Design a protein around this ligand. Structure first.
Ligand SMILES: N[C@@H](CCC(=O)N[C@@H](CS)C(=O)NCC(=O)O)C(=O)O
Ligand SMILES: [Ca+2]
Ligand SMILES: [Ca+2]
Ligand SMILES: [Ca+2]
Ligand SMILES: [Ca+2]
Ligand SMILES: [Ca+2]
Ligand SMILES: [Ca+2]
Ligand SMILES: [Ca+2]
Ligand SMILES: [Cl-]
Ligand SMILES: [Cl-]
Ligand SMILES: [Cl-]
Length: 317
């Protein structure tokens, strides 16, 4: 006439830690009760009750208190597997005892940081100030504690960009120049579990495009400061003299050039504003000598100019 008692004697409840992902059949906890009596009166049958939540645990067999994994548990869904163990003798009116079990699920680092976008992109002007934040990348991590802390890095900022390891803010580290490099495709990395060994850290990367927009910061240039040419005396107006060509490193209208003439010979010559072709406006006589100023002006606002000099001598036929 003794009721089964759980061991150790007077135990209020059982508890054990269980790693999430424990495979089915894995022993989660083993409990035991005793009944001093003889035969069926002292033969103990174990059952489980009130599985909260259900589906994750079962007794290996009803003859013992070994509890094994059924479905695998996910810490991201379940923090506690609670249930009751009933230990019943097999007597005529049976006597039984019941006790709670609390299995404490333990997080493992089974989720990677995952970026909130498939890629990132911004456009910035080439004169953007050093230190300016361009964009923020964000990843999220479904684990807990250190396993969900994220450290951002750039695989290679090229000395032009830097990322804040906490915020994911990508900033200008040194001055840009569209003319040197007009866009960047950077790899940003999110790595969890800071401070642990490389093998227990998970990561993902994403590509970040920064397109560098033009400012009109390059003036038109000629190849040298002095050109020289000759025109025959007594040639008609419209006679070709020379074609002038300047360069400009900017983009679009910022490097679209128009030519003009300046100074004491402008009236005797003309330059086609688009082609750079210089022609005479009249016949020249052999004594005449001109040092013209040729100007190339870009289409920026305000425009930039560059000049060169053009010596024109008139030769006898
Ligand atoms: N040093 C200045 C000007 C740089 C710049 O814009 N240079 C132009 C010409 S105006 C260029 O062609 N840069 C290309 C290079 O240096 O390779 C800056 O850093 O802003
Ligand atoms: Ca008994
Ligand atoms: Ca999990
Ligand atoms: Ca993680
Ligand atoms: Ca986890
Ligand atoms: Ca530039
Ligand atoms: Ca320009
Ligand atoms: Ca430019
Ligand atoms: Cl900008
Ligand atoms: Cl910081
Ligand atoms: Cl680009």
């Amino acid at each position: 006439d003794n009721t089964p008692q759980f061991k150790p004697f007077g135990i209020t409840y059982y508890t054990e830690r269980v790693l999430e992902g424990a495979t089915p059949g894995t022993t989660l906890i083993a409990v035991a009760a005793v009944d001093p009596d003889k035969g069926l009166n002292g033969l103990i049958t174990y059952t489980l009750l009130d599985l909260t939540p259900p589906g994750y645990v079962q007794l290996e067999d009803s003859s013992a208190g070994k509890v094994i994994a059924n479905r695998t548990v996910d810490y991201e869904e379940v923090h506690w597997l609670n249930f009751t163990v009933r230990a019943s003798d097999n007597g005529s009116p049976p006597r039984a005892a019941e006790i709670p079990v609390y299995l404490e699920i333990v997080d493992i680092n089974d989720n990677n940081p995952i970026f909130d976008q498939p890629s990132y992109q911004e456009a910035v002007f080439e004169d953007i100030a050093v230190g300016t934040v361009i964009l923020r990348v964000t990843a999220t991590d479904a684990d807990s504690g250190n396993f969900a802390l994220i450290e951002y890095s750039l695989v290679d900022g090229e000395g032009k960009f830097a990322i804040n390891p906490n915020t994911g803010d990508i900033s200008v580290l040194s001055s840009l120049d569209r003319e040197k490099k007009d866009h960047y495709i950077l790899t940003a990395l999110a790595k969890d579990n800071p401070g642990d060994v490389a093998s227990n850290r998970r990561e993902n990367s994403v590509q970040v495009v920064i397109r560098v927009l033009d400012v009109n910061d390059c003036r038109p240039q000629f190849s040298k400061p002095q050109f020289s040419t000759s025109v025959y005396e007594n040639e008609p107006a419209g006679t070709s003299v020379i074609t002038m060509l300047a360069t400009d490193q900017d983009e679009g209208s910022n490097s679209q050039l128009t030519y003009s003439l300046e100074g004491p010979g402008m009236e005797a010559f003309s330059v086609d504003m688009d082609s750079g072709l210089v022609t005479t406006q009249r016949p020249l006589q052999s004594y005449e000598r001109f040092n013209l100023t040729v100007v190339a002006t870009d289409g920026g606002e305000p425009p930039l100019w560059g000049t060169t000099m053009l010596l024109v001598e008139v030769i006898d036929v």
